[PDB]
C-alpha cells in the first residue's frame, strides 16, 4: 500500500500569512497513463470533507485562487496565501493512482492570536443531582490562548485526582481561543464530608494559577 505522510501535523499561522503543507508518498503517484491523481481536501469542524485540488494543481470550481497545489512524483505541496478565518480546519492529501486509495493523516490549520488567560467558573453540584446519590462539580475554563492548559482540583486544600474528567473544545472560529470543561464526580456521601472545593487553572499567561473555589456550607 502507498502511504501518505503530511507535515506538519498542526500548522499555527497568522491570518494573511502564507501556510504550506507537505505531502510525501512512499511510492510515486505518477500513474501509467501519464497522470498523477493527487487531491487535496478540507474538512471544517462538523462538516464533510470538501474537494480543493485535484490532479496535483487543478482548482475545483468555487475554490479561491489563494489555494495552490504543486509537486510531482513523491513530493507535493498545498500553499495557502494568505490565510483567511474560514480556512480553519483539517487538510488532507489523497492519491487515486493505486489500489487501495489512501489519505494523508491530515494537517490541522490553527489561527494564531494574542495570549489570553482563561475565564474560570466553578459550579457546585445541583441540588437536583444529589437525589441520585452522586455529585459532579463542574469547572469551565473558557476563551484562553494558547491551547496548553492544566487544571487541578483540591478538596479541603488537598489535591484530588480521582473522579476528574476533562473535555477540550476545538479552536473557536470567531475569536480563535480555546475552552475546556473539568468535572469532579464524587459520591453524595463523600461530597458532604468536605467543605471547600477548588478549581485551579495553570496557563502560560501567568506563573501563578487562577484559583476559583466555594465552600459547601455557603
Amino acid at each position: 500500500d502507498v502511504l501518505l505522510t503530511q507535515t506538519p501535523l498542526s500548522l499555527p499561522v497568522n491570518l494573511g500569512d502564507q501556510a504550506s503543507i507537505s505531502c510525501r508518498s512512499s511510492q510515486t503517484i505518477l500513474h501509467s497513463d501519464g497522470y498523477t491523481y493527487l487531491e487535496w481536501y478540507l474538512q471544517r469542524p462538523g462538516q464533510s470533507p470538501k474537494l480543493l485540488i485535484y490532479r496535483v494543481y487543478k482548482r475545483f470550481s468555487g475554490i479561491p485562487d489563494r489555494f495552490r497545489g504543486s509537486g510531482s512524483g513523491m513530493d507535493f505541496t498545498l500553499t495557502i496565501s494568505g490565510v483567511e478565518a474560514e480556512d480553519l480546519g483539517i487538510y488532507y492529501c489523497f492519491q487515486g493512482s493505486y489500489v487501495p486509495r489512501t489519505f494523508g493523516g491530515g494537517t490541522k490549520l490553527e489561527i494564531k492570536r494574542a495570549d489570553a488567560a482563561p475565564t474560570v467558573s466553578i459550579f457546585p453540584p445541583s441540588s437536583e443531582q444529589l437525589t441520585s446519590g452522586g455529585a459532579s462539580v463542574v469547572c469551565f475554563l473558557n476563551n484562553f490562548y494558547p491551547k496548553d492548559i492544566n487544571v487541578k482540583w483540591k478538596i479541603d486544600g488537598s489535591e484530588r485526582q480521582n473522579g476528574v474528567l476533562n473535555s477540550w473544545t476545538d479552536q473557536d472560529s470567531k475569536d480563535s481561543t480555546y475552552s475546556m470543561s473539568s468535572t469532579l464526580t464524587l459520591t453524595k456521601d463523600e461530597y458532604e464530608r468536605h467543605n471547600s472545593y477548588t478549581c485551579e487553572a495553570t496557563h502560560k499567561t501567568s506563573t501563578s494559577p487562577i484559583v476559583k473555589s466555594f465552600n459547601r456550607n455557603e
Partner: protein, 207 residues
C-alpha cells in the same frame, strides 16, 4: 446540483450486520463512481472501495475484504454498503462520495449497550460582570445530543464541550456567557435534544 443523501445513524450489536444507503440526485447516476470512506475520530480517513454503477463491478480495499459489501440499485439511484461481523473497531463515521461531492456521513456505533436517555442538571453560579451559565448532560447513549440556548437566539457566546466516556456512558456539557444585565432579569433556557432516545429536555436556569 449534485447531492448524496446518506441514511441515518446506526446503533448495532457486536457481531451483527448493517446496511447503509447513499441516494444520489441531480445528475446521471450511471455515469459516476460512488466511493465509500471511513473516518475514525473525525480524523483518520480510510478508503473502502467504489462500485461500477452500470456493471455492478466493485473495487475493494483488501483490508476491508469480507468486512464490506458494496452494491447499487440502478433503478433508485442508490448505493449500498453492508458491514458484516461488526466489532467496536467498526464504530466510525462512514461517507459516500463522488469525485465531486461527499455525503453528510453516517455515524455507526457498535455496542451492546442500549439507548440511554440523558440526565440534565443546571449549572448556575453559587452563593464580573459577565455571568456564565451551563447545563450538564450526563449518562446518555449513544451520540449525539444538541444543546440549544434560548431557541438559538444565543449562539455566539456558547461553548459546546465534546462528549467523553464516563462509566460506559457519554457525558457532555455546554456553557453560555451573557451580560449580568441579561440574567436573571430575563430567562435563559438550555434545550437538550437526544434524537436516539426521542428526548427533549428544557431547563430554565434559576439564581
Amino acid at each position: 446540483e449534485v447531492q448524496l443523501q446518506q441514511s441515518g445513524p446506526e446503533l448495532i450489536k457486536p457481531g451483527a450486520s448493517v446496511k447503509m444507503s447513499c441516494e444520489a440526485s441531480g445528475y446521471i447516476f450511471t455515469e459516476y463512481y460512488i466511493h465509500w470512506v471511513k473516518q475514525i475520530q473525525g480524523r483518520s480517513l480510510e478508503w473502502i472501495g467504489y462500485v461500477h454503477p452500470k456493471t455492478g463491478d466493485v473495487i475493494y480495499n483488501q483490508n476491508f475484504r469480507g468486512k464490506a459489501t458494496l452494491t447499487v440499485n440502478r433503478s433508485s439511484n442508490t448505493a449500498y454498503m453492508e458491514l458484516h461481523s461488526l466489532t467496536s473497531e467498526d464504530s466510525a463515521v462512514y461517507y459516500c462520495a463522488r469525485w465531486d461531492s461527499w455525503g453528510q456521513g453516517t455515524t455507526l456505533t457498535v455496542s451492546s449497550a442500549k439507548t440511554t436517555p440523558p440526565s440534565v442538571y443546571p449549572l448556575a453560579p453559587g452563593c464580573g460582570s459577565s455571568v456564565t451559565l451551563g447545563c450538564l448532560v450526563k449518562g446518555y447513549f449513544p451520540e449525539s445530543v444538541t444543546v440549544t440556548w434560548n431557541s438559538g437566539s444565543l449562539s455566539s457566546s456558547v461553548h459546546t464541550f465534546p462528549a467523553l466516556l464516563q462509566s460506559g456512558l457519554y457525558t457532555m456539557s455546554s456553557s453560555v456567557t451573557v451580560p449580568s444585565s441579561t440574567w436573571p432579569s430575563q430567562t435563559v433556557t438550555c434545550s437538550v435534544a437526544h434524537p436516539a432516545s426521542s428526548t427533549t429536555v428544557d431547563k430554565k436556569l434559576e439564581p
